[PDB]
Structures are given as C-alpha cells and as structure tokens.
Enzyme design. Structure first.
Site, PDB file in Angstrom:
ATOM      1  N   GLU A   1       0.685  -1.280  -0.038  1.00  0.00           N
ATOM      2  CA  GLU A   1       0.055  -0.165  -0.021  1.00  0.00           C
ATOM      3  C   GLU A   1       0.735   1.129   0.076  1.00  0.00           C
ATOM      4  O   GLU A   1       0.995   2.301   0.997  1.00  0.00           O
ATOM      5  CB  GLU A   1      -1.004  -0.159   1.163  1.00  0.00           C
ATOM      6  CG  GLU A   1      -2.272  -1.083   0.939  1.00  0.00           C
ATOM      7  CD  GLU A   1      -3.011  -1.475   2.193  1.00  0.00           C
ATOM      8  OE1 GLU A   1      -2.835  -1.183   3.474  1.00  0.00           O
ATOM      9  OE2 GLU A   1      -4.293  -1.458   1.836  1.00  0.00           O
TER      10      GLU A   1
ATOM     11  N   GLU B   1      -4.075 -10.595  -0.543  1.00  0.00           N
ATOM     12  CA  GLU B   1      -4.792 -10.367   0.746  1.00  0.00           C
ATOM     13  C   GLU B   1      -6.441 -10.853   0.131  1.00  0.00           C
ATOM     14  O   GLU B   1      -6.762 -10.256  -0.895  1.00  0.00           O
ATOM     15  CB  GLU B   1      -4.841  -9.003   1.347  1.00  0.00           C
ATOM     16  CG  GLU B   1      -3.616  -8.654   1.889  1.00  0.00           C
ATOM     17  CD  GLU B   1      -3.495  -7.156   2.592  1.00  0.00           C
ATOM     18  OE1 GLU B   1      -4.757  -6.609   3.067  1.00  0.00           O
ATOM     19  OE2 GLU B   1      -2.496  -6.514   2.427  1.00  0.00           O
TER      20      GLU B   1
HETATM   21  C1  IPT Z   1     -10.537   0.028   5.209  1.00  0.00           C
HETATM   22  C2  IPT Z   1     -10.121  -0.123   3.894  1.00  0.00           C
HETATM   23  C3  IPT Z   1     -10.726   1.385   3.449  1.00  0.00           C
HETATM   24  S1  IPT Z   1      -8.133  -0.234   3.816  1.00  0.00           S
HETATM   25  C4  IPT Z   1      -7.957  -1.819   4.094  1.00  0.00           C
HETATM   26  O1  IPT Z   1      -8.149  -1.773   5.569  1.00  0.00           O
HETATM   27  C5  IPT Z   1      -8.030  -3.265   5.956  1.00  0.00           C
HETATM   28  C6  IPT Z   1      -8.314  -3.127   7.428  1.00  0.00           C
HETATM   29  O2  IPT Z   1      -7.966  -4.328   8.184  1.00  0.00           O
HETATM   30  C7  IPT Z   1      -6.568  -3.835   5.695  1.00  0.00           C
HETATM   31  O3  IPT Z   1      -5.662  -3.277   6.327  1.00  0.00           O
HETATM   32  C8  IPT Z   1      -6.340  -3.585   4.321  1.00  0.00           C
HETATM   33  O4  IPT Z   1      -5.153  -4.299   3.883  1.00  0.00           O
HETATM   34  C9  IPT Z   1      -6.699  -2.376   3.767  1.00  0.00           C
HETATM   35  O5  IPT Z   1      -6.592  -2.249   2.101  1.00  0.00           O
HETATM   36 MG    MG Z   2      -2.591   0.001   5.031  1.00  0.00          MG
END
Ligand code: IPT
Ligand code: MG
Ligand code: IPT
Ligand code: MG
Ligand code: MG
Ligand code: NA
Ligand code: NA
Ligand code: NA
Ligand code: NA
Ligand code: NA
Ligand code: NA
Lengths: 1011, 204
Positions: free
Chosen positions: A449, A525
């Site tokens: 990210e 993921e």
């Molecule tokens: C809430 C989304 C806009 S971002 C989303 O949040 C998740 C929460 O567990 C993980 O961190 C994912 O990797 C992320 O893409």
């Molecule tokens: Mg993140």
C-alpha cells in the site's frame, strides 16, 4: 543534527547487512547448529526511562544511570509497560503528514545496560552489537561515547563496539525515538508502538572473517541432479594461505565438499574480486525441499588456513528447491503451487510486537493443522527465528520489505519521489541481504500500500538482478503493474468486477484473461476475516481449483490484534482501537484474524481448513474417488474413515488405508449396505485421518472430510390417533388453549403467543414474535460510524428503512376449533413512517399430541432493503446445560459459510453455542437444522437457529464482549431464513446476491412440542 | 397417488378440507403432497400446497396441479411475464404486464410436440369465468401433457374436449447448451426437497 527528520540519513556507522552469523570456532558446533560461545544474548533486565522529547534527555544519562529509571525486561514495547499509549490507526498516519518532519513532542525511550565483556573478546577480533529491532529510530552510546544511529524498525542494526569496550563492566545507552522520518514508510494497519522490541546480542568475529555468503541451488530438467553454488566474501587481510571450504551434509553424512583460496573469476576489464570465492558442489538425487516435505541439508562454510587450522565457521540450513514462473504458472520443483496462505502480523496480546519462539511455533502448528502451506510477512521482515521455523516445519513464505505509505495523498507521493529512493532502497536491499539463503522464502515483496512509484520499478529491477531465484511481487498501483511478476490483488472478488478508476479490482477469473495478460494470479490479501466473516470463502476455492492460473491467495489475516487491559476487578479483557485513549483511532479494525489474540480459533478457521483440504472426493454409487492435491508426497500417513448414519443414528462405519500418489486418485469401494429400519435421510461422512504423529500434528489428526446424502425414505405413516382433544377458552383479551397439564396463551391485543405452561410452570419471559433484523456484524457495519455514516453499508440501509424501529400492527387474530385441534390465525404488518415493510401471516395448530404446529408466510416489500433474517424469537424462562440438535455443526455456521459443518447429531454445552467475538454481534447460528432440543422443549422443521443468554438488543448495544451480562432465561432466535455474512472485504457490501433475502415471499414451518 | 388423509372441518366463516397424498413407485415414496383448501363466504377457494420430494429421486420436471376444464374460452388474460412463452431459464425477454391473447396463441406448435407455452411469474390468470391468483407459472391449451407426450408430430395433435390447465408452483429449466446431454443448470433444477405454493381460485 536531527537525523530523525531527514530521509537522507537512515543510519550512521552501521555495519553492512548479511545473513545470520554465529562465528563458530568449532566446525561440529556449526554443523549441528548448536549455541556459539561467540554469540551472546543481552536480552533480560535493562534500565529504562521515558521522556516526552529528545530535548528533555539529560546529558548525565550518557555516563550515569538515571536514579529515576526503572528496571524493565528487554525486548519489549514501552507502551506494553504503560509508559505511554499504543495507538490504533489503519490508513491515516498517527502523525501530521508533513514529511520529513515529526512532532516536537516525540516520546523518547532511554534504555541502558551495564554488562560484562570477557577479556578474550577484546584481546583480538571484532566485537559488535546487534539490535534485531528498534522502533522507529535510535542513537547508540557505549561508555558515554557516541557510536552510531539507525532506522528501519524491522531489520537488525549492527555496530562495531571493538574500540569502545573494556574488559569487565561496560554501559550501553540507547535513545529510542518513537517518531522519525522512517515512520513515513511505516504506515501499516496495526498498533503503532515503539521500543527495543527484538533481540539484542553481541557477536565476536575474528579480524579476518567471513563477511557474507550466498547459497544457490540449480537443477537439471527433472530435478534428479543439482549444483550447489556458494559465494563467500571475506573482510580482513588477504593471505595466500587462506582458504574456504564449503561442505554440505545430510544428516550426519557429508555428501559433498569443496575448498579454494580466495580470488574470484574475472568480472570486468579491471579483474575480479580478490576477496571472494565461489565453491561449486555437485549433488546427485538431492532430497528436495517443499512445504510438503521440508528436506534440509546443512551447509558449513569454513574460513581456515591451508595447513588446516580453523579461523571461523558460518553455516545455514539449505533446502534444494527451484522457484520459477513459466507459461503463466508459479512452479516449485517444476509443479504448480496452490497457495493456501495467510497474512500474519507479529502480534502478542500481552507483549505487543515482541515475538517468542513458543508463540511462533504455536502459530505454525495451527496453520499447518488447518491446511495452510504459506504465509505472507505482512508487511515487514519478521524476527529471524521465523524463517528458521518455516524452513524446518515447511511453509512457503513471502518476505516483504518494511515499506508502507498508505496514508499519503496520492498513495505513491513518496514512492514516486526520487528523494525517497535511498530510504526505500535500504528497506529492500537489507532484507534480501539478510534472508536470501532461507529456502522457505520463495517470493520477495516490495512492501505494501504505497501506490506505484518509479522507486518501486527501480527496486523491482534491483532484486531481479541480484536474486533471480525468486519472483518479485508488489500489489500497489493496481496489482498488475510493471513492478510485479504475479497479479497480486487485495480483495478482488471471484465473479464481481469493482471497476475503480485507475486501480480497478477485476473479478479474478476475468483478470487473468485481459488482453495481453499472461501472469499467474495469487491474491496478496482476500477473505477479510473481521469478526463473523469468511462468507463466500468456498467461492474462492472452487475458482482456484478450476483455473490453473488462479494459484490461490493469502487470507487477511491470521490473528486478531487485540490487546489485554485489566478491569476494576483486575480481570483482563480484550481491547481494540480507542481503548487506550488513542485518538483518532480505527476501533475494531485491528481485529481481522482467523484466531483470537490468544490463538483460540474463531469459527471461520474450520471453514478455511475444510476449503484448503489436500484431498478431493467424488461419490459414484458405492464408490468413493479420492484425489490427491499433493504435488510431491504419497498419502503415507493417511487412512480413510467412513460412516453412514440415519438422521444422526449410526448405522455403519469403516476405515480404509489411503495410498494415493501426488495428484493421483484412488477408488474405494464401499460395502453393500444394510437397510435403514425406518424413515429418514441416510448420510455418508468420510474423513482422512493421520494415524501417526508428525512434527506438526498429533496422532489421529483429521486433515479432510466430506459428506453426501445417500437414500432418503420419506415418512408416510400416519402418526397415532391422540385420545385427548385440546380445549379453547376465549376471553376479550386472549385465546387460551389447554391440553391436560399444558397451556398456551395468545394475547388478542398483540396477536402473539405470550405465555406457555407445563403445569403451573411458565415457559416464556418474552412473547414469541417475528424478528427481521440482526445485531449487525462487522461486515454489515463496514466503515460506517456515527460521526460519519456510510449510507451504503447494510446496517445503515436497514436503519434508514426503519427495520430496527419497525413496530408490528395486528391485522388479524382469530381462533377456530377443529375436530381434533385448535387453530389460531394471525396477521401482522411492520410499518415505518407509513410504509409497510413486512407482513407476517401465521397459523398455530395445537392438537391432542401436545405439538404446536406453526406455519409462517412473510411478504417483504420489494423496495425495502433485503432483511437480515426472517424468523421468530423469544426469551425462554429456562436455562439448561446442553443444546442438542440434528443439523449442521458442530461449530457456528451461516448460509455462505457452512461448507465445513457436517449434518449430524450434535450436543454441546450452552456456552459453546455462543461465539465470543470481541466486538459483539449476531453470532452462533447453526443452519440446516431439522430438530433442536433444549430443556423440555423440542423444535422440529428445517431452520437456522441461535441460542444464548444475550438478546440481539444487548449484542447490538454492547461494543466489547467483556461488558456483556447473561440475561435471565435463554434467548432463542429460530429463522426460516438468514442472510449471508459476507467478508470479501469489510468496507463495502460483500454479501453475494444468492445469499440475500430477496425472494419477496417466504414460507417456513416449525413444530414446538415439549415434555 | 396414494391417499393418506382427507378431512373436512367447519370454520367460523369457512370450510377447511385437508388432504395428504403419496406417490410411490415399486414401494419407494417419490413425493408427498399436503394441502388445505379453504372456501370462505366470499366464494374464494384458497389452496395451500406443501410438497416433499425424496432427495434421492431425480429432481422432477415441475411441481404443480392440473385439471381439464369444461370451458373452452376464446381468450386468455393474465398479469405476469409475457406475452410469449417463457420458462425459468428462458424468460429474460418476457415483460411483466397485463397480457391478453387468443387461446391458440397459448400453444406453441413445435414440430415434434412437447411441454410448451408456459408463462412464468404470473400473479393472476383469467379464463372464462375463472380466476386464479398467486405466484405461479402456467400453460393452457386443448392438448393434455399425455397427448403431447404421445404424439410425434404436431399435425397429428387433436384438440381434446375442454381446456387443459397446468398451473405450477415450480417448473424446471428447459436447458439447451446442447440437446444430447443434460444441460439444465443446477440453479434451475427443482432440488429444494420441500416446496410451498398457494393459489386462490374464484369466479370473475
Ligand atoms: C478499510 C479500507 C478502506 S483499507 C483496508 O483496511 C483493512 C483493514 O483491516 C486492511 O488493512 C487492508 O489491507 C486495507 O486495504
Ligand atoms: Mg494499509
Ligand atoms: C549440472 C546440473 C545441475 S544441470 C545441467 O547443467 C548443465 C550446464 O551446467 C547443462 O545445462 C545440462 O543440460 C543440465 O542438465
Ligand atoms: Mg533519518
Ligand atoms: Mg461439503
Ligand atoms: Na488454480
Ligand atoms: Na475513528
Ligand atoms: Na486491520
Ligand atoms: Na496411507
Ligand atoms: Na455490538
Ligand atoms: Na411428443
């Protein structure tokens, strides 16, 4: 200098990175991996003091212990010692975005240690100290004199203390800053902590030493031959008499060895590396390494003299395996992998981000026992021991650089900026330098990210160039950029496209075939396991099995990041974002695992284990076809057990040895069967059992299962003529039915069954009423919050439509006496602000047998949001010890998450029918149930149910499980229908259409009968 | 059919007939049909049907009722999908509206005769003096399923007396991905095991 506010400085005087060293001075010790007297741990009790900012640290601290400091355990996170608060934020940075600056109030941890060093260490050679992990940046002093500085919280920082120590007692002083310019590249979705959280150690190396070594293994076409190549580098004085010997062992047997003086081949017009040498060893029929059979050899690298005197030795575990992408497929030893992966953060509820061997082992065993074969180090290099366990127990690993800049706008703001290349580059290069010899690491990742910037392309190419043996992946920028060898999206859906501009997330099946696309696809993921989730999990598996190029994925994630806090009663409880006064915070978003923080499983875990099975089955008449999904091993620790049962009643069972070749089949012929002596459904259940214990499983471990329905014999025999007839007593306010010692009372004003008696004992605490809502799951809420509603979230749709506030208006309530029964008819409408949401029409037929037959026909306005459930509920006056049912089980299961559950007769303690999610919600449902027994009650039909001491109301108004309180009696929710729970993501509606209650008209029927 | 139960009861404002039947073959029970017919003071007959299908018998072609009406009317009027023939896996082109065609148009003259002319998603059907309401699929014509099944060519079909009405709660898909191996998709197979439907029959 303010080095912590300058991305141009990420260290000062730090030694080069390299693979794990121990400087053995005995070959046999290196060979056996025994402790080295030249590698000492400094973990244990240290002195520590907290300051609000670096400017508040007294200079006296450099030469003298501060009296006010405390003695604390190291490694540790200071937030875990109560010095300041841990902060839970997901995307938004915990500090003002204003690179490369950090706040002036910057919590500073002042650690120190007084320790001894043996004279022998200082009489010769080099003494360095190694900090395996300091978050986020620090300066180091020894005996009051400044040594150096370092950044990157997840890689070891090493410094030579040879010129600073004295024999006897010495004092280290480490000034750790919580925030630094390195925090800009440390924006992962996890608690934000700080401190010396990984091991501290002292390593003694000789002046003339092995400074680095790289091991590579290449093979012939069929892997029946290999060549082990080891490049070794030295520091110190070159002498013609020096030599390096590399020997390889299998067990106690040395299978190959080679010796050479230093001096590499010619590289360019100026010559070659005089300080290096590469040894090449032939290996015939090597035992290959895989997650299935993690065979390892031991390579020992000796630096010595020609006359044979040893100077020092290094060594590592070697796993002979090839990783390559060919024709669109990721191959391991030439066979295509199917990644049964999970993302795993380094988290301990008590210790924060400090990791220990026991915890790591527990994680690996549970992963393997649940059919996982791979793990992603989301999103940073892990504690060094992790790789050693994965090499030895057998797991494929994705090693990932500690780079995440999620909260930038746009995401690639820093990653596309050349001024940030240097800081980024060391997070990638230093990882590779440290981990490139571990066989378990099969893929490198550029971070997470951080959009897609030119810096990523540069680093992608650097790795490809330095280590061609492993693919490189990176998801940022749309998951299919030029900086990735694998299409590795996060949360892309199986069939549904999500055409976001610039970075669309196509359906995975469609993504593979886009024009010109040829790479494999493995989700970095997917199946966001937040709370009651993993709905739709099976959908992914079916697709991975059907499409060669869909090679699996990594579930998000392994374990909930909850932390322990203690109540007024000193009772510990599970805390999430905001519970430490941290604000802003991301509340429950830190909890997304398949297991609770203490490693207890959430129900989704079994769904994953079942979908990730390594044996597939088909049934044809009496033949069972078993197919193996193993690529390398035969089923040599497996037997098939089979059982036939009539409505849970055992009828027949057997076992058969399984002897299947990898990817082969075996047909097992089942025995002619006796006939069921009566009506019902016969079901066949098979399970694969491992009779023998393994390094990761106990004897008798169940690795896979499946069931099928066999013959069913419909019941046509008319019951028996009851000799009693029920009587109806009519009053202005009620209709009462009496049948000997039993009574049923229907309130004429409400239109509901308000009370039931067995003798004089009332059975109900609240009337039996329809219910069309549920205490919202995390997937139903998504990112909606009171202060910022997300109107598209399921919960908000229901709320806005008035589902939670709807009130039943009675349309009709009548009573009819039949020949042998009493017939109650009712009709109600649920309305909101003038709109009719639902209409429920029912009949209650009570006969001489004491059974109450309830029929329910519901109409749902096509324009109102599809409801969470269509059922009834009541609060029972009884509290019983057990719950017994004929239906899917035994664990909690929902419509889109029930493949793991099996249909049989289950019996458990009432408390197990409650799933204690940290953030409470509807939980504990069991589906496809034909009979439910509780206390003196029996319900039969074809429904879904949950039963517990908590009302849906309480569940929805309580934000932490520890604050729940058992209500009087037992709340029973019995549903004719229940909506799926979703989980493809936990931020946008994810319940697939087929699991939404959109039929418009619903019918279900139940019979309630008691003692 | 094997009759299992047949009873009549008098309600405050209605008469209630309860029946139950079993269809068996060589001792196996294929289907069980349980119904109630409630005739009220308004002249309306509400028929509730609840069927069980053995999980081990092949999923049946349909789940409905049929009868031969004495009436031969000129037109057929219905509120549902139309105007043309449509089946569960072949109904996207049909529109929900009020349709009214001559009777003959409710029959499709496939050269090799078969089940035909169904219309799905119907809420109301009118024919002659009769009216049926609910949520069903139906076909109507002068040929019985029996005759259609026994006649190889459309030119040899003969109108029978009266009109045959097949009113279904559920009907299987027709398929067609190919015509040489089973092609009806799982989602259009009647494999639920238990089915419920209700119809109201009245005059005008
Ligand atoms: C809430 C989304 C806009 S971002 C989303 O949040 C998740 C929460 O567990 C993980 O961190 C994912 O990797 C992320 O893409
Ligand atoms: Mg993140
Ligand atoms: C030596 C074996 C590991 S592979 C061996 O390598 C050779 C080059 O050295 C050739 O490429 C052979 O074709 C190949 O089988
Ligand atoms: Mg800096
Ligand atoms: Mg199954
Ligand atoms: Na695949
Ligand atoms: Na918040
Ligand atoms: Na999270
Ligand atoms: Na076996
Ligand atoms: Na809640
Ligand atoms: Na025919």
């Amino acid at each position: 200098r303010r080095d912590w506010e300058n991305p141009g400085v990420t260290q000062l005087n730090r030694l080069a990175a390299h693979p794990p060293f121990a400087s053995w001075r005995n070959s046999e010790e290196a060979r056996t991996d025994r402790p080295s007297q030249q590698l000492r741990s400094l973990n244990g009790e240290w002195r520590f003091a907290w300051f609000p900012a670096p400017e508040a640290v007294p200079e006296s601290w450099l030469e003298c212990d501060l009296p006010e400091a405390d003695t604390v355990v190291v490694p540790s996170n200071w937030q875990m010692h109560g010095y300041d608060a841990p902060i839970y934020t997901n995307v938004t940075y915990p500090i003002t975005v204003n690179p490369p600056f950090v706040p002036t109030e910057n919590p500073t941890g002042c650690y120190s240690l007084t320790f001894n060093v043996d004279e022998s260490w200082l009489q010769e050679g080099q003494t360095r100290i190694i900090f395996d992990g300091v978050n986020s940046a620090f300066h180091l002093w020894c005996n009051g004199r400044w040594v150096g500085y370092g950044q990157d919280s997840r890689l070891p920082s090493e410094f030579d203390l040879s010129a600073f120590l004295r024999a006897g007692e010495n004092r280290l002083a480490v000034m750790v800053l919580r925030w630094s310019d390195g925090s800009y590249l440390e924006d992962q979705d996890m608690w934000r902590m700080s401190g010396i959280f990984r091991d501290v150690s002292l390593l003694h190396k000789p002046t003339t030493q092995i400074s680095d070594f790289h091991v590579a293994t290449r093979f012939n076409d069929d892997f029946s031959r290999a060549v082990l190549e080891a490049e070794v580098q030295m520091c110190g004085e070159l002498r013609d008499y020096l030599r390096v010997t590399v020997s390889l062992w299998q067990g106690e047997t040395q299978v190959a060895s080679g010796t050479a003086p230093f001096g590499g081949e010619i590289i360019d017009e100026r010559g070659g590396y005089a300080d290096r040498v590469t040894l090449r060893l032939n290996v015939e029929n090597p035992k290959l390494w895989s997650a299935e059979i993690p065979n390892l050899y031991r390579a020992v690298v000796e630096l010595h003299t020609a006359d044979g005197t040893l100077i020092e030795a290094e060594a590592c575990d070697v796993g002979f395996r090839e990783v390559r992408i060919e024709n669109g497929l990721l191959l391991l030893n030439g066979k295509p992998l199917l990644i049964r992966g999970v993302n795993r953060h380094e988290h301990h509820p008590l210790h924060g981000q400090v990791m220990d061997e026991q915890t790591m082992v527990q994680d690996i065993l549970l992963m393997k026992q649940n059919n996982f074969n791979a793990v992603r180090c989301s999103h940073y290099p892990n504690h060094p021991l992790w790789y050693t366990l994965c090499d030895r127990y057998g797991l494929y690993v994705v090693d990932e650089a500690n780079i995440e800049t999620n909260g930038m706008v746009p995401m690639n703001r820093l990653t596309d900026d050349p001024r940030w290349l240097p800081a980024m580059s060391e997070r990638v290069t230093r990882m590779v330098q440290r981990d490139r010899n571990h066989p378990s690491v099969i893929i490198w990742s550029l971070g997470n990210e951080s959009g897609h910037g030119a810096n990523h392309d540069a680093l992608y190419r650097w790795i490809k160039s330095v280590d061609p043996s492993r693919p490189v992946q990176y998801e940022g920028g749309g998951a299919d950029t030029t900086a990735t060898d694998i299409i590795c999206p996060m949360y892309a859906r199986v069939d549904e496209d999500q055409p976001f501009p610039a970075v669309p997330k196509w359906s995975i099946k469609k993504w593979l075939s886009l024009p010109g696309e040829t790479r494999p696809l493995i989700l970095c993921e997917y199946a966001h396991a937040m709370g009651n989730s993993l709905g739709g999990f099976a959908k992914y598996w079916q697709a991975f099995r059907q499409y060669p190029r869909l090679q699996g994925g990594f579930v998000w994630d392994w374990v909930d990041q909850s932390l322990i806090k203690y109540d007024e009663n000193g009772n510990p409880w599970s805390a999430y974002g905001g519970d430490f006064g941290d604000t802003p915070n991301d509340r429950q978003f830190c909890m997304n695992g398949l297991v609770f923080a203490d490693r207890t499983p959430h129900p989704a875990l079994t769904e994953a284990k079942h979908q990730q099975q390594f044996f597939q089955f088909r049934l044809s008449g009496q033949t069972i076809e078993v197919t193996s999904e193993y690529l390398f091993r035969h089923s040599d620790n497996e037997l098939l057990h089979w059982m036939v049962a009539l409505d849970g009643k055992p009828l027949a069972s057997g076992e058969v040895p399984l002897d299947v070749a990898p990817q082969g089949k075996q047909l097992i012929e089942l025995p002619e069967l006796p006939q069921p002596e009566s009506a019902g459904q016969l079901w066949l259940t098979v399970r694969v059992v491992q009779p023998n214990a393994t390094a990761w499983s106990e004897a008798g471990h169940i690795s896979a299962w499946q069931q099928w329905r066999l013959a069913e014999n419909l019941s046509v025999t008319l019951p028996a003529a009851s000799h009693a007839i029920p009587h109806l007593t009519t009053s202005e306010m009620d209709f009462c039915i009496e049948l000997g010692n039993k009574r049923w009372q229907f309130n004429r004003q409400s239109g509901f069954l308000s009370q039931m008696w067995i003798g004089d004992k009332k059975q109900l605490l609240t009337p039996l009423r329809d219910q069309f809502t549920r205490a919202p799951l995390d997937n139903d809420i998504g990112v909606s919050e009171a202060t910022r509603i997300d109107p598209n979230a399921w919960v908000e749709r229901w709320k806005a439509a008035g589902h939670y506030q709807a009130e039943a208006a009675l349309l009709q309530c009548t009573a009819d006496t039949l020949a042998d029964a009493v017939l109650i008819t009712t009709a109600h409408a649920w309305q909101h602000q003038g709109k009719t949401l639902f209409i429920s029409r029912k009949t209650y037929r009570i006969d001489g047998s004491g059974q109450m037959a309830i029929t329910v026909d519901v109409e749902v306005a096509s324009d109102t949001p599809h409801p969470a459930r269509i059922g009834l509920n009541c609060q029972l006056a009884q509290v019983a010890e057990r719950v017994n049912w004929l239906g899917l089980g035994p664990q909690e299961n929902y419509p889109d998450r029930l493949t793991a559950a099996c249909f049989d007769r289950w019996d458990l303690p009432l408390s197990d029918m409650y799933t204690p999610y940290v953030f409470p919600s509807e939980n504990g449902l069991r589906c496809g149930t034909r009979e439910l027994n509780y206390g003196p009650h029996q319900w039969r039909g074809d429904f879904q149910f949950n039963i517990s001491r908590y009302s849906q109301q309480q569940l929805m108004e309580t934000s932490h499980r520890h604050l729940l309180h058992a209500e009087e009696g037992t709340w029973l929710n019995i549903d004719g229908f229940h909506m799926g729970i979703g989980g493809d993501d936990s931020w946008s509606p994810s319940v697939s259409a087929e699991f939404q209650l959109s039929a418009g008209r619903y019918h279900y029927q139940l019979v309630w009968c008691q003692k």
